[PDB]
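Follow-up to my post from last week.
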Amino acid sequence: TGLAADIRWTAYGVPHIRAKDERGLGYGIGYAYARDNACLLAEEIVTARGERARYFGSEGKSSAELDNLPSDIFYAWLNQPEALQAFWQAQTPAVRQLLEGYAAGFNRFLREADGKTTSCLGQPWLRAIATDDLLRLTRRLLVEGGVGQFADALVAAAPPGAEK
Amino acid sequence: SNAIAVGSERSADGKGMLLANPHFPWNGAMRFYQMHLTIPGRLDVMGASLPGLPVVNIGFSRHLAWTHTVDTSSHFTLYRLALDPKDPRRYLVDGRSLPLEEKSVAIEVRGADGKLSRVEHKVYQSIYGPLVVWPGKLDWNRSEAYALRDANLENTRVLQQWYSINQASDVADLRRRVEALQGIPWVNTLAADEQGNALYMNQSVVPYLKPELIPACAIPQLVAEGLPALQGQDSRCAWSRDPAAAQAGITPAAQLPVLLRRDFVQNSNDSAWLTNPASPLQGFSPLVSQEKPIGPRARYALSRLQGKQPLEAKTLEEMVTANHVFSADQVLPDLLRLCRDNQGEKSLARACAALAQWDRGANLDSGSGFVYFQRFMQRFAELDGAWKEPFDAQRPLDTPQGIALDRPQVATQVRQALADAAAEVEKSGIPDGARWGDLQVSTRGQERIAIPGGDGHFGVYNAIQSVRKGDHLEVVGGTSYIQLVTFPEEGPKARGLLAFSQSSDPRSPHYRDQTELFSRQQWQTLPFSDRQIDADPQLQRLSIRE
Ligand SMILES: CCCCCCCCCCCC(=O)O
Ligand SMILES: CCCCCCCCCCCC(=O)O
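User reply:
Got it. Predicted complex:
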């Protein structure tokens, strides 16, 4: 609570969010983004949570074109609870508030969605999000210039056997 | 991605100007989204951002515009481990055998029967980070393995960093805020402000090794191939500590390239080196910036930016919308000479006619010559010493150039490559009357929209990457969020588009509206002031609370 935003949309559905604080500002962002892209965010959160194989099986791929199971192993390793907790603890009050607002606003849209702009209505993976999910997405992006480029390589790393 | 910042010495109005032309995916977790954020009195910023982030990543405010491009700096290092000769799950540091740590993760997998089963996987970790395998290159045998230390794993400052940028007043303030926090993970930052300053910063999170450690700490054979690889059996090859860095083991801000000028700065994903040739950036760590030949996008930009003539907004816009295939400038004149030299060859007839008639562009109405040129260049790139003028470090803007047709061995191979490229184009299912826009498309529901632009590797500033799907080339990435900002007296004037539209959802009114406009290359006002917003006849408003 203490969440409030004013949203104006101009041509092409560009949102202009006004609020008195970061919580309210994030509230408007999460809501406007969900109106346009709820399904996209839901899918990418599934990816960043390492749950692709759980929802979609081993034959599919992520939108980064990694196989579901290796992708899941990588993101389960990357986004361990301890890593998420330390990341959260290091965040300023302003950033925490932005993220809290965003999650609340996205979830508000989900509660109200009737399919008008949401093609994945009714899918089990379209669900309320938490700030940890936004941390999962952030950390996924953070490592794109690093260990993220080696996701398959990390999954493939196993000690030698008895071979010659 | 491309970025150009123009300052008071070169702009038509004597103020700042910025072109932002990021080249990024058209789908997925890096799909740009436009938004304007306001907390009245202390925050007012507009631009575009990646999914899930409650900040503006590329944008502008009252006095400032900024953008980013992926840099050439390393943001991780590989460490070659010397394995314990008695145990391949142990590794040596200063001659002492250390055990690898094992972290298991469990994953649920939905099977063919629709039921879940649990899969457990072991991740091996060293003091540096997890082990990585590239079969046939970075193996894990009984002698060696490779671990990866990612510098951004400890960068908890990334969101605060963009929020801080969002609050920046001008170029000087922006620079202070970025250098102070060092939260930018893997991009350059370029910016212009109303007072006419143009800023380039190679200011990101980069592993730091003191200069004297590099000769013995690098893996010579891997660094030669552009991999940041270090000796992991020597404790002295740990990233160096400097109290001035915002994060332990990263390069201090004073040691990273910055160029602050009043004419221009530019970047097209090359190093800091030739950001502005009048003032080369040199003498940085190999992990930071090297004097490598620039790609054809930067070479194109510099050919248009250098000199004494003023640059207007229209000039910067048209550098994108021209769709000029700049690689043709180096190759096509001599290729056409070869064509005229071989008018008897029926295997070359169609190719040579198509190339002769070609407008040298990746426009919607550009002829099949672009396709022939692409398939030729793919093969040309693999020929040895075929350049008439090879890259010359003393002429880094004008070389390489031309085909060494006077060498009989080159003429043979170049003709063969053209013959092979022609055969490939003709083997495909493309009628010769078809134009580029007939081939390159973005699918929207059951329809297709023609998309101008071409691969950045061919020097098209409007870079578009496509893949063959069905009977067309489907756009996967490239020009995405476009923003062109100037600063007239009334307030910032921003012009551009989001090429793939606001919504990824086929049901949305904003699924393809800007894509139709991108196809016709019709950029639009990005309304920022209350006056501009209120002038929009499509204005809608909703206030929400809980
Ligand atoms: C799908 C093609 C669109 C182009 C996207 C390239 C941007 C990838 C960002 C990764 C950061 C990095 O390369 O260090
Ligand atoms: C949490 C990490 C956030 C990273 C935001 C990157 C924004 C700029 C991306 C575009 C760069 C480019 O086009 O080269």
